[PDB]
Structure formats: C-alpha cells, structure tokens
Design an enzyme around this catalytic site. Structure first.
Site, PDB file in Angstrom:
ATOM      1  N   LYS A  47       0.797  -1.212   0.000  1.00 21.13           N
ATOM      2  CA  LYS A  47       0.000   0.000   0.000  1.00 21.13           C
ATOM      3  C   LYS A  47       0.834   1.268   0.000  1.00 21.13           C
ATOM      4  O   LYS A  47       0.332   2.326  -0.406  1.00 21.13           O
ATOM      5  CB  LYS A  47      -1.000   0.010   1.153  1.00 21.13           C
ATOM      6  CG  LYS A  47      -1.720  -1.351   1.381  1.00 21.13           C
ATOM      7  CD  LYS A  47      -2.452  -1.830   0.113  1.00 21.13           C
ATOM      8  CE  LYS A  47      -2.825  -3.323   0.185  1.00 21.13           C
ATOM      9  NZ  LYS A  47      -3.205  -3.804  -1.183  1.00 21.13           N
ATOM     10  N   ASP A  81      -7.598  -0.874  -4.151  1.00 14.66           N
ATOM     11  CA  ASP A  81      -8.178  -1.633  -3.034  1.00 14.66           C
ATOM     12  C   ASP A  81      -7.586  -1.102  -1.729  1.00 14.66           C
ATOM     13  O   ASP A  81      -6.520  -0.506  -1.740  1.00 14.66           O
ATOM     14  CB  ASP A  81      -7.813  -3.118  -3.178  1.00 14.66           C
ATOM     15  CG  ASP A  81      -8.580  -4.007  -2.199  1.00 14.66           C
ATOM     16  OD1 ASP A  81      -9.667  -3.584  -1.771  1.00 14.66           O
ATOM     17  OD2 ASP A  81      -8.058  -5.099  -1.868  1.00 14.66           O
ATOM     18  N   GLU A  95     -12.073  -8.452   2.564  1.00 12.14           N
ATOM     19  CA  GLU A  95     -12.304  -9.805   2.090  1.00 12.14           C
ATOM     20  C   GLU A  95     -12.448 -10.774   3.256  1.00 12.14           C
ATOM     21  O   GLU A  95     -11.609 -10.811   4.157  1.00 12.14           O
ATOM     22  CB  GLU A  95     -11.215 -10.291   1.118  1.00 12.14           C
ATOM     23  CG  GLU A  95      -9.756 -10.244   1.632  1.00 12.14           C
ATOM     24  CD  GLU A  95      -9.055  -8.918   1.282  1.00 12.14           C
ATOM     25  OE1 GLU A  95      -9.751  -7.907   1.071  1.00 12.14           O
ATOM     26  OE2 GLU A  95      -7.816  -8.902   1.234  1.00 12.14           O
TER      27      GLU A  95
HETATM   28  C1  SAM Z   1      -3.064  -8.179  -1.968  1.00  9.84           C
HETATM   29  S1  SAM Z   1      -2.072  -9.349  -2.917  1.00  9.84           S
HETATM   30  C2  SAM Z   1      -2.823  -9.302  -4.564  1.00  9.84           C
HETATM   31  C3  SAM Z   1      -4.298  -9.708  -4.542  1.00  9.84           C
HETATM   32  C4  SAM Z   1      -4.886  -9.781  -5.937  1.00  9.84           C
HETATM   33  N1  SAM Z   1      -4.917  -8.427  -6.548  1.00  9.84           N
HETATM   34  C5  SAM Z   1      -6.291 -10.329  -5.816  1.00  9.84           C
HETATM   35  O1  SAM Z   1      -7.237  -9.615  -5.467  1.00  9.84           O
HETATM   36  O2  SAM Z   1      -6.484 -11.514  -6.078  1.00  9.84           O
HETATM   37  C6  SAM Z   1      -0.595  -8.272  -3.084  1.00  9.84           C
HETATM   38  C7  SAM Z   1       0.522  -8.806  -3.966  1.00  9.84           C
HETATM   39  O3  SAM Z   1       1.327  -7.771  -4.530  1.00  9.84           O
HETATM   40  C8  SAM Z   1       2.646  -8.226  -4.701  1.00  9.84           C
HETATM   41  N2  SAM Z   1       3.461  -7.006  -4.703  1.00  9.84           N
HETATM   42  C9  SAM Z   1       3.718  -6.173  -3.649  1.00  9.84           C
HETATM   43  N3  SAM Z   1       4.448  -5.109  -4.074  1.00  9.84           N
HETATM   44  C10 SAM Z   1       4.656  -5.274  -5.425  1.00  9.84           C
HETATM   45  C11 SAM Z   1       5.332  -4.537  -6.392  1.00  9.84           C
HETATM   46  N4  SAM Z   1       5.960  -3.404  -6.098  1.00  9.84           N
HETATM   47  N5  SAM Z   1       5.334  -4.983  -7.690  1.00  9.84           N
HETATM   48  C12 SAM Z   1       4.674  -6.125  -8.057  1.00  9.84           C
HETATM   49  N6  SAM Z   1       4.013  -6.872  -7.108  1.00  9.84           N
HETATM   50  C13 SAM Z   1       4.037  -6.464  -5.816  1.00  9.84           C
HETATM   51  C14 SAM Z   1       2.868  -9.156  -3.514  1.00  9.84           C
HETATM   52  O4  SAM Z   1       3.896 -10.083  -3.803  1.00  9.84           O
HETATM   53  C15 SAM Z   1       1.484  -9.772  -3.289  1.00  9.84           C
HETATM   54  O5  SAM Z   1       1.290 -10.983  -4.002  1.00  9.84           O
HETATM   55  O1  43G Z   2      -4.336  -6.386  -0.502  1.00  8.04           O
HETATM   56  C1  43G Z   2      -4.428  -6.407   0.822  1.00  8.04           C
HETATM   57  C2  43G Z   2      -3.262  -6.380   1.599  1.00  8.04           C
HETATM   58  C3  43G Z   2      -3.433  -6.381   2.995  1.00  8.04           C
HETATM   59  N1  43G Z   2      -4.640  -6.451   3.620  1.00  8.04           N
HETATM   60  C4  43G Z   2      -4.757  -6.405   4.963  1.00  8.04           C
HETATM   61  C5  43G Z   2      -4.022  -5.432   5.661  1.00  8.04           C
HETATM   62  C6  43G Z   2      -4.113  -5.287   7.041  1.00  8.04           C
HETATM   63  C7  43G Z   2      -4.980  -6.134   7.734  1.00  8.04           C
HETATM   64  C8  43G Z   2      -5.758  -7.094   7.083  1.00  8.04           C
HETATM   65  C9  43G Z   2      -6.695  -7.962   7.846  1.00  8.04           C
HETATM   66  C10 43G Z   2      -7.422  -7.402   8.907  1.00  8.04           C
HETATM   67  C11 43G Z   2      -8.336  -8.155   9.642  1.00  8.04           C
HETATM   68  C12 43G Z   2      -8.521  -9.490   9.303  1.00  8.04           C
HETATM   69  C13 43G Z   2      -7.807 -10.064   8.258  1.00  8.04           C
HETATM   70  C14 43G Z   2      -6.885  -9.297   7.521  1.00  8.04           C
HETATM   71  C15 43G Z   2      -5.636  -7.204   5.704  1.00  8.04           C
HETATM   72  C16 43G Z   2      -5.758  -6.482   2.836  1.00  8.04           C
HETATM   73  C17 43G Z   2      -5.694  -6.485   1.433  1.00  8.04           C
HETATM   74  O2  43G Z   2      -6.824  -6.536   0.679  1.00  8.04           O
HETATM   75 MG    MG Z   3      -6.253  -5.882  -1.359  1.00 11.13          MG
END
Ligand code: SAM
Ligand code: 43G
Ligand code: MG
Length: 218
Positions: A147, A172, A202
């Site tokens: 983030k 997101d 989620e």
């Molecule tokens: C929240 S998950 C992705 C969820 C996916 N968008 C979904 O909803 O199914 C975040 C992912 O971003 C990748 N990531 C984090 N920083 C990144 C970057 N600077 N460049 C490419 N991927 C990155 C991480 O390895 C991780 O798998």
């Molecule tokens: O893409 C993402 C990366 C991190 N979190 C995230 C970040 C901080 C806390 C939690 C969380 C909080 C409560 C229960 C489960 C997960 C989840 C959520 C996402 O959608």
């Molecule tokens: Mg997310």
C-alpha cells in the site's frame, strides 16, 4: 497436476484444481472465496469488493488493463472474465512463486488468452510497458500491491505517459489498512476525479473501501 500444499498459496490452487470446474472462471472465483472464507484467510480482493471491481469494468469497458499485485490470480481471473475479445490484462507480480500460481490459476479459469503476467517489481516494469509490452496508454489500473507503493506507482505511471484523459485508477484497501498519501494526492489533485466505494475487507466484517480516480489529463 497438484502442488505440494506446503504454502497457503499452493493449497488455494490445489483446492481450485480439485474442486472447481476447469474453464469456468465463475466456478474458480467461487472456489477461492469459499476456501478462504472457510479454511484460510487470504488477501484476495474477494467477492463483495470484487463486485465493485466488476461494476467499474462494466461501466468503463476497459480494453487495456493493468493490475499491480497478482498474488494467486483471483482478481486477474475476476477482471479477465469480463473482458471483450481482444482486451488485454497485464498483471505484475514481484514474487516468482505467486506468479507461477497465478499463471496456473489463469490457465485453469479459461482466461489465459486475455492475460499477460509479468514477474517483477512494478517500479521496474512500469517504465518498460510502452517499449517492451506494446502499451500506448492504460484504460484502467487496479492497484492492490503493497500500500506504500500506491502513490509512487501512480506518479510513475503518470511520469511514463501511461495515463490519459479518462484512465480509470481503482485502488483496493484505502481503509484497511489505508494508503493515505495516495488518497490525499488523488482527492486533492485537480488531475483526478475521485469516487469512494465503502465495502468490507475480504472474508471479514471489517470495514474497507476502494477509491476510483479518473485521470483528467495533466
Ligand atoms: C493483496 S495481494 C494481490 C491480490 C490480488 N490483486 C487479488 O485480489 O487476487 C498483493 C501482492 O502484490 C505483490 N506485490 C507487492 N508489491 C509489489 C510490487 N511493487 N510490484 C509487483 N508486485 C508487488 C505481492 O507479492 C502480493 O502478491
Ligand atoms: O491487498 C491487501 C493487503 C493487505 N490487507 C490487509 C491489511 C491489514 C490487515 C488485514 C486484515 C485485517 C483483519 C482481518 C484479516 C486481515 C488485511 C488487505 C488487502 O486486501
Ligand atoms: Mg487488497
């Protein structure tokens, strides 16, 4: 065939491969969401926020989409299933193990032809999109990676000439956990028109939200 199931990511893919209909993207999404609701939380955008992503795509009808952060390919499948013939989703994932799962997920869901998965860091790849990946500008960007990278990547996309009048950014997690510098930038800038979509994290009852920011031009 199946992976070892040593990691949450392998077990999520394994569940899909065993329990979803091959070639059915909806069945794939449902299988991931069910497993993650019931067995192991995972950071997929999930079904409720997924519905919002769906709506944004349905309204704006992008043909050239970029996703930052693929993970296991849930959002890539979710977005690609909605795309018209000849639309392209480029998705960037830094972790090679995750990227390998994502490609398997994409293939299984029947959406392989719509997806270009790029292993690498967004800040390294985004400079290359025009020259290496035959991109003119982006219709839509889904930001769902680390983030603290939302702001620098948005500025980088602008710097690289990938944004045009009308480009839709959708981020997101602007509530949980938040990306306040990004949010301040897009809301405060006359270069973006913003809309907030409150929802839920989620698989949880925790409040979350996404922000849509439409680029107005420089
Ligand atoms: C929240 S998950 C992705 C969820 C996916 N968008 C979904 O909803 O199914 C975040 C992912 O971003 C990748 N990531 C984090 N920083 C990144 C970057 N600077 N460049 C490419 N991927 C990155 C991480 O390895 C991780 O798998
Ligand atoms: O893409 C993402 C990366 C991190 N979190 C995230 C970040 C901080 C806390 C939690 C969380 C909080 C409560 C229960 C489960 C997960 C989840 C959520 C996402 O959608
Ligand atoms: Mg997310």
């Amino acid at each position: 065939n199946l992976l070892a199931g040593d990691t949450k990511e392998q077990r999520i893919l394994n569940h899909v491969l065993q329990h979803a209909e091959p070639g059915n993207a909806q069945s794939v999404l449902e299988a991931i969401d069910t497993y993650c609701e019931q067995k192991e939380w995972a950071m997929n955008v999930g079904d409720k926020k997924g519905k919002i992503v769906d709506a944004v795509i349905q309204e704006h009808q992008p043909s050239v989409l970029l996703e930052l952060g693929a993970y296991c390919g849930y959002s890539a499948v979710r977005m690609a299933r909605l795309l018209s013939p000849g639309a392209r989703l480029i998705t960037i994932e830094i972790n090679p193990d995750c990227a390998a799962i994502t490609q398997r997920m994409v293939d299984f869901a029947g959406v392989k032809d719509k997806v270009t998965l790029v292993v690498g860091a967004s800040q390294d790849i985004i400079p290359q999109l025009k020259k290496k990946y035959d991109v003119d500008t982006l219709d839509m960007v889904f930001l769902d990676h680390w983030k603290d990278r939302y702001l620098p990547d948005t500025l980088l996309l602008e710097e690289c000439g990938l944004l045009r009048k009308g480009t839709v950014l959708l981020a997101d997690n602007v509530i949980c956990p938040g990306a306040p510098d990004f949010l301040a930038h897009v809301r405060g800038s006359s270069c973006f028109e913003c809309t907030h979509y409150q929802s839920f994290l989620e698989y949880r009852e925790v409040v979350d939200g996404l922000e849509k920011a439409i680029y107005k031009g420089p």
